[PDB]
Write a structure and sequence with these properties.
Chains A, B: It is an enzyme of class 6 (ligase). Two copies of one chain form a homodimer. Chain A is an alpha+beta fold and 316 residues long. Chain A has two domains: 139 residues, PurM-like, N-terminal domain (60s Ribosomal Protein L30, Chain: A); 160 residues, Phosphoribosyl-aminoimidazole Synthetase, Chain A, domain 2. Helices cover 34% and strands 28% of the residues of chain A. Chain A is built from eleven helices and 15 strands. In chain A, the strands form three sheets. In chain A, strands 10-12-7-13-11-14-15 form a seven-stranded mixed beta sheet. In chain A, strands 1-2-3-6-4-5 form a six-stranded mixed beta sheet. In chain A, a hairpin with a 2-residue loop joins strand 8 and strand 9. The radius of gyration of chain A is 20 Å and the shape is globular. At the A-B interface, helix 1, strand 1, strand 3, strand 4 and helix 4 of A face helix 1, strand 1, strand 3, strand 4 and helix 4 of B. The structure holds chloride ion (4 copies) and zinc ion (20 copies). The site of one chloride ion has 5 residues of chain B, from helix 3.
């Protein structure tokens, strides 16, 4: 898969010269609009829509699509503004479309954005079900971009607790759990399809409020890659105490996926991470906990690169 | 299909209040960024990709995707800036991806834009081939939006000649012509799959040059809807002399599709239309003909709404 994709990525990178010394030049991708940067991001829901089809429950899949886009905008400090959607279907089912629209409205409400357009394509010779994707745009001032460059040792890492499972980990979870257990298996009070369909969490409001009130050095959406999303932020290392394995991640880990790979695939209870100075710890926790449960995770340390999960004995 | 889609469109319109008195408020969709409007548009290639799969020729389908997006941006006078793509595949074929990338590069070159991101989703339980879509953003100053409000009677309509077929008409053309004739049928020097796969034309450069040099009252991308795209521009009517039926449109019209519906579905030889004052006619034709063959079509007339195609005896 990776080999084929490099062709598209390499071709797109050659088009950057077409905006040289022009408005909107690229430099989330960040577009130079002189007065600000325009952040742009693109993501689909993936195979989580297969669980939605299996149980005829589509009213939260639009929350997932919006969440994957707007959470990647706030990574760089951008305020999400608008989103356009791409919906490709085999057949136009009125009742499914009304379900999808409810999740799109609620997701746009939490993210504080407007859904300003999109395309619905009925292609039964092409799609065998439902495919939902989207593109989001945000705005960030040029001196407010959160790059992670200001992350220094002794900075504190704070995690905001997650909700649902992302697309990459959901492929492994479906493939590992559905044949053995079935979608109707009850695990720890929730049926398996509920664990797999539960929408991911939208972090726009607590993060925008945090950035407005607190000195922030780093922002990481814990999506595909797990703690690897934290590693790309800085050349320094981390020393974390991740929360106990719990929920659906306990069942997956019980079913043979090694610890080292769990933290590289799933969010493991933390959906978003912030990095503030030592002194801002209590300010930051107090703001974020108005919204979701947030908690101290670890610190930035001097030994470069590696992430050391103390209470597990894992290194990434 | 229409009934189901209204649910998504009505839900998206309710989210507009979420940007009230905020940056990027909606008002192509146009986003109020104070210093300018950001135009945003979304479109996929549709079933033209089925012809590409049938003949293993994917090196122009990316031209189509970019053309459908950037031609809808310049409709309002916006300069296209960037594009992100959504590619959903059954299998990641390296050779097909290298083909697609060539068309994306060449299309971005003609449109003068950068491809700044996107998502490729390998979902074999979801796609049975290839699905290519995209979103484009452009910029237009607030006092430069071409709305069509300045269109008045005696204004001259100029058409820029088209290239290929759009997605809506391609569905009718495949369905009408492929069973009777086969993709290998030679019609007027080109095989049928070549008529159906030929990319649509990118009009960014001649239109941007026109808007910079000439007083322009109206801009219409002749896409899905045919001459109906001209009708939405103004409450006044039109009196046109469309070019003779020719090329693949001759074979379709020979195969039973009525004249009135041809001008409502296909581009009929004109891919883009501009409306300038009477006095600008020769200035405008001289600029556009540096790029593609452009020609006088008709005029705006006083009798409201209806489009009268003189040399056919059709009214729309
Ligand atoms: Cl997400
Ligand atoms: Cl996850
Ligand atoms: Cl087009
Ligand atoms: Cl057409
Ligand atoms: Zn530059
Ligand atoms: Zn994704
Ligand atoms: Zn993402
Ligand atoms: Zn009904
Ligand atoms: Zn400043
Ligand atoms: Zn600082
Ligand atoms: Zn997430
Ligand atoms: Zn101090
Ligand atoms: Zn402080
Ligand atoms: Zn205190
Ligand atoms: Zn307003
Ligand atoms: Zn379309
Ligand atoms: Zn279009
Ligand atoms: Zn190879
Ligand atoms: Zn001005
Ligand atoms: Zn004028
Ligand atoms: Zn076109
Ligand atoms: Zn004069
Ligand atoms: Zn003049
Ligand atoms: Zn002259």
């Amino acid at each position: 898969t990776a080999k084929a994709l490099r062709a598209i990525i390499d071709a797109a990178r050659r088009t950057f010269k077409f905006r040289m010394n022009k408005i909107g030049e690229p430099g989330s991708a960040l577009l130079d609009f002189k007065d600000f940067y325009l952040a742009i991001t693109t993501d689909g829901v993936g195979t989580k829509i297969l669980v939605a089809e299996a149980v005829n429950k589509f009213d939260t899949i639009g929350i997932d699509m919006i969440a994957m886009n707007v959470n990647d905008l706030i990574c760089v400090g951008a305020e999400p503004v608008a989103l356009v959607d791409y919906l490709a279907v085999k057949e136009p089912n009125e009742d499914v479309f009304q379900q999808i629209a409810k999740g799109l409205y609620e997701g746009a409400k939490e993210a504080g954005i407007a859904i300003v357009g999109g395309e619905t394509a009925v292609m039964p010779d092409l799609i065998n079900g439902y495919d939902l994707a989207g593109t989001a745009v945000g705005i960030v001032e040029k001196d407010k971009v959160v790059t992670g460059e200001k992350i220094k040792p002794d900075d504190i890492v704070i995690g905001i607790s997650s909700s649902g499972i992302h697309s990459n980990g959901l492929t492994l979870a479906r493939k590992l759990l559905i044949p053995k257990y079935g979608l109707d298996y009850e695990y720890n009070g929730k049926k398996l399809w509920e664990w797999l369909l539960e929408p991911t969490r939208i972090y726009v409001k607590p993060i925008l409020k945090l950035i407005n009130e607190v000195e922030v050095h780093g922002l990481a959406h814990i999506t595909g890659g797990g703690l690897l999303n934290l590693k790309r932020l800085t050349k320094y290392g981390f020393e974390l105490e991740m929360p106990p394995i719990d929920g659906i991640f306990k069942l997956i880990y019980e079913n043979g996926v090694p610890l080292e790979e769990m933290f590289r695939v799933f969010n493991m209870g933390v959906g978003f991470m912030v990095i503030v100075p030592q002194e801002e710890k209590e300010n930051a926790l107090q703001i974020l906990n108005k919204y979701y449960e947030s908690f101290e995770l670890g610190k930035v340390i001097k030994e470069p690169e590696k992430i050391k999960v103390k209470n597990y004995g894992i290194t990434l």
